[PDB]
Amino acid sequence: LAPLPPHVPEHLVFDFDMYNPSNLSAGVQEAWAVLQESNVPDLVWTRCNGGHWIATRGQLIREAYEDYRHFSSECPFIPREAGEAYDFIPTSMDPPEQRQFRALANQVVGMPVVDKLENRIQELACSLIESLRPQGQCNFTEDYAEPFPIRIFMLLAGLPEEDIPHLKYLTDQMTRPDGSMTFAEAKEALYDYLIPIIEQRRQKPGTDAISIVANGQVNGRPITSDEAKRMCGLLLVGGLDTVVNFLSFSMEFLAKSPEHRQELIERPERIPAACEELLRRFSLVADGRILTSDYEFHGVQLKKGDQILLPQMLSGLDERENACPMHVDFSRQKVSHTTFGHGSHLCLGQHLARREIIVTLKEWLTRIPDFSIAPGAQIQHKSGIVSGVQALPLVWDPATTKAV
Ligand code: HEM
Ligand SMILES: CN(C)c1cccc2c(S(=O)(=O)NCCCCCCCCNC(=O)[C@]34C[C@H]5C[C@H](C[C@H](C5)C3)C4)cccc12
Ligand SMILES: [K+]
What we know:
Elements: H1 28-32, E1 43-46, E2 52-55, H2 58-66, E3 71-72, H3 80-85, H4 97-109, H5 111-132, E4 137-139, H6 140-145, H7 147-156, H8 164-175, H9 183-203, H10 209-214, E5 217-218, E6 221-222, H11 225-237, H12 241-256, H13 258-266, H14 271-281, E7 288-291, E8 295-297, E9 300-302, E10 307-309, H15 312-315, H16 350-367, E11 372-373, E12 381-382, E13 388-389, E14 393-395
Parallel strand pairs: 2-10
Antiparallel strand pairs: 1-2, 3-7, 4-14, 5-6, 7-10, 8-9, 11-14, 12-13
The structure holds protoporphyrin IX containing FE, ligand DSO and potassium ion.
């Protein structure tokens, strides 16, 4: 517990630990939802993780994401040292400089790219699932959720399949840390992999994402090598743990809810809506911002340099915006969430991510309509900037399945 700053009133202190919240055993969204109990104010200060604010309600979360002038992305992670070291593009930039970098990134992971990749996304899902189907078991996180998005990235980035276990090694070191290296070191090791590739594709561009970013123009001039690297690191990591962990949450839920599986089998037209309602219920990101100036917000004095956690996760779980928020209803009306963020940094990958989710749901239930959690296994969640599932052992009777 860091010393409480004298500008912070004691009545706003609530020592939530985003990397190890109490009651994690109840589920990680449930653990974060403690922040929305009736005796917790809308904006609190936690002394954990160096000390920082947390906005606990959708209205404040969206407001702060809109107000980039006060709430800057230059240090967007807790703890401060990680946020300081972090320099990916565009996530560590504010508008207006951010806008042209975001437009360049949009050309390589935005919507039209989706239609070009869609046949490979479909084929990859089907091939992975058929490999598992006859076995009657898998560790879903390891056997489907991890290989699916990284294979898609390698295709969009024009990288060879054999590079996958090394890239995985490198991203795990960053995003699945064990305290052996600092964020800065893991980040540099990732940059070491990308720097030669960007050099190569600046001399000899192709039509892959790295070539397009590395040869782009921004605010009137060519992008530098360093800018390209910082963009490519985000394009790699952006759709990896988010998708891995979101799919895992979704499949845990479906494994525990035969009635919702049957619903999507009998009414496949509801799968897009189901995707949105799972994105709401199993929202999983929590990053934040740094104050650019002293600012009073919702009656609370914020100080220049204070960090504020703005959990994307919480908006859709807020009872003030969605009734019975922990309940999953594929027929829910007025589904609201900020799962993909809000404001100037609203996820560029969201159309790709929804395609990945919808293809998985449809192709999984087509071949393996009936499955359960392995008997006896205790599913464990993890919490942090991207919350997730540690492992997801599933079982089924292969006689209930079909090759398609
Ligand atoms: C379920 C999956 C995903 C979730 C929940 C998710 C969530 C988010 C969130 C919350 C942000 C905003 C962060 C900020 O405001 O600080 C964001 C930004 C972004 N994400 Fe996604 N993401 C997902 C998938 C992907 C995928 C598949 C990619 C593809 C490479 C991707 C690319 C990006 C990029 C480039 C940005 C930065 C946009 C900018 O800063 O203007 N995302 N994502
Ligand atoms: C107990 N031990 C094990 C530990 C516990 C806790 C911290 C530890 C750290 S730490 O404190 O240095 N690491 C905590 C922050 C790690 C940042 C990961 C995000 C980077 C990639 N993602 C994004 O860019 C994005 C950017 C954006 C938001 C979000 C989703 C998408 C889009 C991708 C993230 C170091 C070592 C050990 C630690
Ligand atoms: K920084």
